[PDB]
Write a protein that binds this DNA or RNA. Sequence first.
DNA 1: TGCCGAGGCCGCTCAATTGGTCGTAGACAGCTCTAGCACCGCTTAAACGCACGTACGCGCTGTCCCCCGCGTTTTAACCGCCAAGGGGATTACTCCCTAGTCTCCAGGCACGTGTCAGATATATACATCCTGTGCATGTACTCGGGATATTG
DNA 2: CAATATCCCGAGTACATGCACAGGATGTATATATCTGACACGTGCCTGGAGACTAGGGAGTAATCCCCTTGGCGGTTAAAACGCGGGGGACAGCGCGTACGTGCGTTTAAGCGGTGCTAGAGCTGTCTACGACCAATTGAGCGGCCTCGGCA
Lengths: 81, 79, 56, 56, 29, 91, 97
Amino acid sequence: LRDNIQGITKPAIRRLARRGGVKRISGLIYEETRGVLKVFLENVIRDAVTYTEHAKRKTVTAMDVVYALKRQGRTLYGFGG
Amino acid sequence: DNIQGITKPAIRRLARRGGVKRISGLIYEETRGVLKVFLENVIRDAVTYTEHAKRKTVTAMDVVYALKRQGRTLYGFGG
Amino acid sequence: VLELAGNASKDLKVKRITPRHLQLAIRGDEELDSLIKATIAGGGVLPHIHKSLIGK
Amino acid sequence: VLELAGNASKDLKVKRITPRHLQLAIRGDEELDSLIKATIAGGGVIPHIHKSLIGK
Amino acid sequence: LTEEMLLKREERARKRRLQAARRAEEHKN
Amino acid sequence: PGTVALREIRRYQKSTELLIRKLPFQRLVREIAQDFKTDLRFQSSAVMALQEACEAYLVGLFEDTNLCAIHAKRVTIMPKDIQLARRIRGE
Amino acid sequence: HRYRPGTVALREIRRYQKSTELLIRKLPFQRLVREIAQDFKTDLRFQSSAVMALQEACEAYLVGLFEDTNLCAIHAKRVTIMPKDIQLARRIRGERA
DNA sequence: TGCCGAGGCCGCTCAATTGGTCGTAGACAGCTCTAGCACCGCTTAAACGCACGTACGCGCTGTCCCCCGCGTTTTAACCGCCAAGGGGATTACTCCCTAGTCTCCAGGCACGTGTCAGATATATACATCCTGTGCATGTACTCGGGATATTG
DNA sequence: CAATATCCCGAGTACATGCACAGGATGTATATATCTGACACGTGCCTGGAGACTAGGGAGTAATCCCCTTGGCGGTTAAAACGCGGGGGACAGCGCGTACGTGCGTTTAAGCGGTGCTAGAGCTGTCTACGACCAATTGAGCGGCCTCGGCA
């Protein structure tokens, strides 16, 4: 895959920011926030793939990512488990 | 009252280990607030593990298990 | 649930869609402690502007 | 133990004691993550002082 | 190559002029 | 002046939609998994369950980041605030 | 002879950041944990080593709170710590609000 | 004087919120499932909880004895302020690219069953490893005197 | 340059530690065991691919002044250092709980057969909620009429 973190386009970061309650966003927040999101994805999808490899599956499934989240103190309600 | 025996210079020592140069005079009576609530939250659990087992002295293991529960583990007294 | 339907009523609807959980589970003082760990999927956020960012 | 080569021997003192392990387990950083959840009794802290507090 | 953007922009032109016809005739009453 | 930026707050704190475009986020998660193993397949609900957890982390970080900008008497958030909010949080 | 304000504060850092000894007096902290306990169960007894594991955990909490507080004061251009700093640190770590 | 100039009160028109009414589309509640497989009831021979001096371990207790606390004030610059300047964060527009929809289309594999094995549990005999105890020195400590470093 | 301080080195210092010892409880060792689930086999689904198209968004730019940023501000205390107070510190013993052992008997697990609860079924069969549109309201700014204060 090419460079797909650039697909978290600047306006989308502003939407997330706007939800969070902030008025004014310096231009260096965009390239910092992509950095934070890529580090979070790495540390959850690694666990989700290790739960997958244990079961001899190829397809990653919703319970794998939910168990991956559950161990990091970041439990998600909505997809079971 | 017994909480005022967490004397001003003791707070300064704790602070000095933490690396702060200069301490506002409002920090003394405010810091006592956070110590008093922290002790409140682990003694509730330590006396809970005590009352469970019917004994009526709090052991080192009780305060270890109380601290372990709240994510503030100590290695020292019995893991 | 007692307090959640208690708020579906206030928005004048019949069926408790997902945000009506968030607006209790992360609004009652004891529930906010019991469910710290939980993200409610599609649950939204409790609305708030910081008092210093509004003008005049 | 082992990474205390970098500590006990460097202080010219024999017998590992609790002011070590601290001053190591919270200095090497493949570890630390394994033991964040734990204070070391009688272990103190590593020296620092932030660059704005020291005289300019 | 160019035909895609050309016929897209042609479609936008008839779209515009349909809106012109409609929002002009909103002035009738 | 300075009012339309504030009008957006009242919009996005009422809606509960997902705020990142779906396909661009899905192709990023396929990229990040390739260095863990080649030729995964993702279940269509797994990709959603990532997005729901990401947005809920990002928006929690901007909530905790703004508090730092207020502390420095500013309005504008800056990377030094994100850095503080992550360091003090223990990331 | 008399030093400059600042000189002795940095001398104290290099002292208490090199020792590992306990910083609160024993008896005054031992009185405090008894008073907070008797509000929850009357006529307790403590083992002599239980109160030590309280103290060694408290000091290590206080010292961590200050280390995370000073980070706020430094960010806010000051060097002095003030209550408004602790309220920020303790809110981002999710303890109080 | 003068003049008037500057001065102070009241209907248009537009632009968000607010609440109302229209109609239509899946998605919710409910039915009948039916179906079946779990809950129950009914025995059994079963494990493990539990109410209960006494040896006695240590939690708590009555003394004296001192630093660190406790108190003062000078000062010292820390920290606050305000006001100005520059730009860079912001706004509003136009062009543009793809996000998203649907639709067709395949086979990858996650799903499922069909058999029955190498697995690990359990017993008895048992030897051995490991604990608790008792037991010298070796050091890491606290102190005193002088050298080197650094503040003002 | 003077002074307080940290650094450094050797004497003298209890006991901590590492060791040796007796001995006990448990890890081993062998035989047996069924059954977990490994493995093998197909079942059928969705994960994926692959197209056509609009319209939403995204990116870009332009203009610009808000907000940040900086300097210089004036005002007051944490720090420094000392004097000065009482309080944290080190011993004598009581007996109460904790442990631990004994015999306390409550309940669970298991295997028994019967049976009704639940969870997958529908186009169920609608119609709450979902857009779609209309209508009200307030507020704000711009014209317009009218007393009076400073000037000829």
